[PDB]
A = this chain, B = another copy of it.
Amino acid sequence: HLTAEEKSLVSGLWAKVNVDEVGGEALGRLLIVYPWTQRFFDSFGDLSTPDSVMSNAKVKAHGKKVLNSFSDGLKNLDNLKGTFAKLSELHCDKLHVDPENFKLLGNVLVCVLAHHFGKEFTPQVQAAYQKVVAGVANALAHKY
């Protein structure tokens, strides 16, 4: 339930997203800011400091998958349930990630967009992006 204005606010900014970096930054920050989230990422090698998190090649590559997945979500805002259904079962049934962490990651993503865009990440833009991440987090959590 984003408005048309909100759709173009989101798309407007998203087109400017550094797709190679932003996902990794958001994931790195999640891992740093909420350290229990590292439990899911033992195969990722060194996450022992912020600097290793932020230089972790796999965090960067996987963060890029997470970002593309968001992009996926932005192209299917009228069907996030379907778009995220298998990832929902992945996260819930294989990975056992508590859904609260989807919200945190969404919000860290928002922090990273704010960081990257500054004044352009207006309260309105953020508002639109908050619906997207809520929609994504809810779509991901909809498999329990």
Interface of A is mostly: loop
- For the complex of A and B, 2 pairs with smallest distance between CB atoms: A1-B144, A134-B144
**Complex contacts, A144 vs chain B, CB 8 Å:** 1, 134
Q: Report the contact-size class of chain A (Cβ under 8 Å from the partner).
A: under 10
A-B contact pairs, 2 of them (CB 8 A): A1-B144, A134-B144
**Residue of chain B at shortest CB distance from A1:** B144
**Complex contacts, A1 vs chain B, CB 8 Å:** 144
CA distance A144 to B144 in the complex (A): 17
CA distance A134 to B143 in the complex (A): 12
CA distance A134 to B1 in the complex (A): 23
**Residue of chain B at shortest CB distance from A131:** B144
